[PDB]
Design a protein around this ligand. Structure first.
Ligand code: ITN
Ligand code: ITN
Lengths: 205, 205
């Protein structure tokens, strides 16, 4: 499996986690004659792509319905952080608890694209003792961060999204809970393709 | 047109330009009873969405084939910048000329999603006197930046993408040419909807 093409998907936020570019670069160097066709889409779409054979492997968020039909190998777990406007009152706090936002508007992406990550944001607020008020939905976490800059609310994001230094936003660690965003390598059961095997073994030497 | 829904599209990179969140927030405050349905997609898809009626207005890049069928109002022009790995030899230069990359690999997004921006990157290199070697394609400019962090090549991006401070990349202004990335508000000709009118007049008071 030194020649051919591999269709590799990942979520938009997952690309900001170092494991994704690290794996892509490592595979390209070890197997230069395998063309990587890269697709950026959310976990719901990536799982469907794996199921229908339009993707060969994906960096996605584990836990979705039917995930037991695929192989899932954990690649990164990272804390979740609050993103807020620089002038938000909580930005002056020495320690940030989620209860400070019990009456704040949360911006999010539409649940249907990534149920597990969306639900983990809601449950984080529930663990802090409140039902969050969800305001404007935006398509991706980067889109949400840009609306946070316009003071439309706050959000909770994978820690690696703190690289997205939109002017006028700040990222803070959460004093509660330690909610975590998870990234796994996903691929079909009983797909014995040697190219896929070479990719999986590159990601997990 | 104080009630209803407006379907608003924008490209993933365009959200990092302040005009997009500024306009969305201003409209939401002036017309709270109009629901904004936000879609993030590239200029090719946004133009098709406007044509088929699945979008009402878009922040897109002007110049595409058939653009004369729509209204296009310029909203922002910004310089384009080089994004490269922090350890690239040109990162030490006092002034950055595109000819320094004449033998470097350029990473880009697939041309079909945004012909005008893609072609402006190629022509920038041509104006500098070389045909660029295009390496790995990634789906969006943010995806490309993350691969630049893995030292897979360099790219040219709208200046506002310099907010995307992926660890291990740097952004530099270009000594040549002044290549510019353009953002326009696009909507259908002869669409007399009062909600759309209210949005357009919010963006251009
Ligand atoms: C918005 C999401 C959630 C998902 O696709 O699982 C992401 O960027 O990872
Ligand atoms: C990749 C592009 C080009 C386009 O969609 O016109 C962008 O993010 O703006």
């Amino acid at each position: 499996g030194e020649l051919g093409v591999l269709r590799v998907g990942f979520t938009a936020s997952s690309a900001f986690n170092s494991v994704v570019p690290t794996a892509i670069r490592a595979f390209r160097r070890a197997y230069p004659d395998v063309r990587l066709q890269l697709e950026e889409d959310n976990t719901t779409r990536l799982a469907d792509g794996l199921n229908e054979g339009s993707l060969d492997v994906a960096f996605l968020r584990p836990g979705f319905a039917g995930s037991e039909r695929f192989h899932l190998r954990m690649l990164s777990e990272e804390p979740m952080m609050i993103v807020m406007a620089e002038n938000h009152p909580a930005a002056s706090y020495e320690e940030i608890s989620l209860s400070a936002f019990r009456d704040e508007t949360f911006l999010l992406f539409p649940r249907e694209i990534g149920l597990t990550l969306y639900d983990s944001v809601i449950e984080s607020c529930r663990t802090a003792g409140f039902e969050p008020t969800i305001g404007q939905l935006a398509p991706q976490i980067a889109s949400v961060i840009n609306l946070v800059a316009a003071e439309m609310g706050v959000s909770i994001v994978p820690a690696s999204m703190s690289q997205v230094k939109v002017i006028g936003v700040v990222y803070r660690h959460i004093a509660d809970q330690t909610p975590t965003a998870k990234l796994a390598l996903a691929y079909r059961r009983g797909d014995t393709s040697p190219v896929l095997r070479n990719f999986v073994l590159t990601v997990f030497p």
